[PDB]
Write a protein that binds this ligand. Structure first.
Ligand SMILES: Nc1ncnc2c1ncn2[C@@H]1O[C@H](CSCC[C@H](N)C(=O)O)[C@@H](O)[C@H]1O
Ligand SMILES: Nc1ncnc2c1ncn2[C@@H]1O[C@H](CSCC[C@H](N)C(=O)O)[C@@H](O)[C@H]1O
Ligand SMILES: [Zn+2]
Ligand SMILES: [Zn+2]
Ligand SMILES: [Zn+2]
Ligand SMILES: [Zn+2]
Ligand SMILES: [Zn+2]
Ligand SMILES: [Zn+2]
Ligand SMILES: [Zn+2]
Ligand SMILES: [Zn+2]
Lengths: 255, 257
């Protein structure tokens, strides 16, 4: 146990680092931030009046939920999991309820905002360096963790030498560079049959340039499984020239 | 006794704050929006550049005097239970710099208190002769963080044109430019705290996740033991409003009676 909790206790649960392959110490070239941060001034519309909100007097589980309507439909169930209706292959924007809404803090449409609740562990992989794995069975359609880091412009992103920790938001483009600041997500490797899917979300602000990226389970993840998502194409078109996917799956497109 | 609301905070706080009425027939106040955190309507440019943060490199629980954060606040004024030391100057309180996400230390170090939230058992209640008030339901040790004064961030320009100024609080006194918190349209339990000439609460300026020195946050600490059932109060600032409203705190030394 090279680290008992890489998050210095900021998260709800501890995320320990372990190594039983090589003799590398707990990674420490970065700053663990549990929430997104900015260096450059990024003007985000935190005008409260500009918030779309709902006036529900239920637990926002009726279809009168404005917040639910904005997201086409409240996609959450009673256990805070996605409905089987949820389009995994082309996910919609989700608008969770916010401090502007009339409803209570425990209504159905508050999930990603509550934080990560899963048991994760940073561990050393045989062939990919560091990786993240669950220590517990994860039901399908469960919110695992948020992709968090630094907010940068496409301008800023192109001049960045190290681009291995980036994530394109909307296509003007903004980015998250998890290189210098990030959370557990920065250590998640790629996979061609992924058990994780990114979903764009809005909570306390609805500035549509700056969605937050939540990973949901695409299937059951068994305790001990390593997480993975599809990095996309720009990665494996250039970086694929140098590296190569070693997901170890029958349908590896970038082997 | 009518429990007119089981929790005025819709569960945003760590504990529920219920409203009760056992004097007149007024329903739970509702011309405002309970926000647990400070908000802005107008764009207020606050420096949330992470690199602009002063931070510490403690590897302890920030209880050594090497604590940069502690140094900035002259001294970590907190004890192990998160209460102020008896050394704390009640009559002239310093700026406090709590530890932030930039620091090297853990989230449970000594110098994180106001940031953790309100933990005490409070209750919005109807007073006989002051309208609404806030009351503790439990003994409060002296030097305990009670609640934060929270609302809308507005300029002195904006504040002067505001008709209703009963819910204001001056932050950055002079320094060329002054900002305010107007708890009128958005606020928390603090907006209901009445004045008192022998106050059991004191405001203390604090910095946590940002150190933009125009925009301190205002934390109330207990100046003494508050017994379960006592109403809270602080000294407002009467300067003008006192030109007809006469204080009914009901203390022997009421200066605005
Ligand atoms: N499925 C995969 N197969 C091979 N290399 C991968 C991979 N997913 C990520 N990587 C490598 O991971 C690098 C950094 S991103 C992930 C962090 C890295 N695993 C670490 O040890 O900290 C990339 O440069 C990429 O080459
Ligand atoms: N010591 C005091 N005696 C009487 N009224 C007071 C008081 N301190 C504050 N108030 C009243 O509190 C008003 C608004 S601020 C606090 C809210 C107030 N308790 C309410 O009835 O909602 C002031 O305008 C003033 O009239
Ligand atoms: Zn809701
Ligand atoms: Zn709703
Ligand atoms: Zn809502
Ligand atoms: Zn592959
Ligand atoms: Zn600290
Ligand atoms: Zn320190
Ligand atoms: Zn510190
Ligand atoms: Zn008085």
């Amino acid at each position: 146990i090279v680290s008992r909790d890489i998050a210095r206790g900021y998260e709800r649960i501890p995320i320990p680092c372990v190594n039983a392959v090589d003799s590398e110490p707990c990674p420490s070239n970065y700053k663990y931030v549990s929430q997104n941060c900015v260096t450059s001034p990024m003007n985000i519309d935190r005008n409260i009046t500009h918030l779309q909100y709902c006036v529900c007097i239920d637990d926002c589980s009726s279809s009168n939920c404005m917040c639910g309507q904005l997201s086409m439909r409240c996609w959450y169930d009673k256990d805070g999991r996605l409905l089987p209706e949820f389009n995994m292959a082309e996910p919609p924007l989700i608008f969770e309820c916010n401090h502007a809404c009339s409803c209570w803090r425990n209504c159905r449409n508050r999930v990603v905002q509550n934080g990560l609740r899963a048991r994760l562990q940073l561990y050393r992989t045989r062939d990919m360096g560091w990786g993240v794995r669950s220590l517990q069975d994860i039901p399908p359609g469960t919110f695992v963790c948020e992709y968090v880091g630094e907010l940068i412009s496409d301008s800023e992103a192109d001049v960045r030498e190290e681009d291995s920790y980036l994530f394109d938001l909307d296509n003007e483009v903004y980015c998250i560079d998890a290189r210098f600041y990030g959370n557990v997500s920065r250590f998640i490797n790629h996979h061609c049959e992924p058990n994780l899917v990114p979903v764009r979300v809005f909570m306390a602000h609805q500035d549509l340039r700056f969605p937050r990226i939540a990973f949901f389970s695409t299937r059951l993840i068994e305790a001990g499984e390593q997480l993975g998502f599809d990095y996309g194409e720009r990665f494996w078109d250039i970086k694929g020239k140098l590296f190569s996917c070693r997901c170890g799956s029958p349908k590896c497109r970038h082997s």
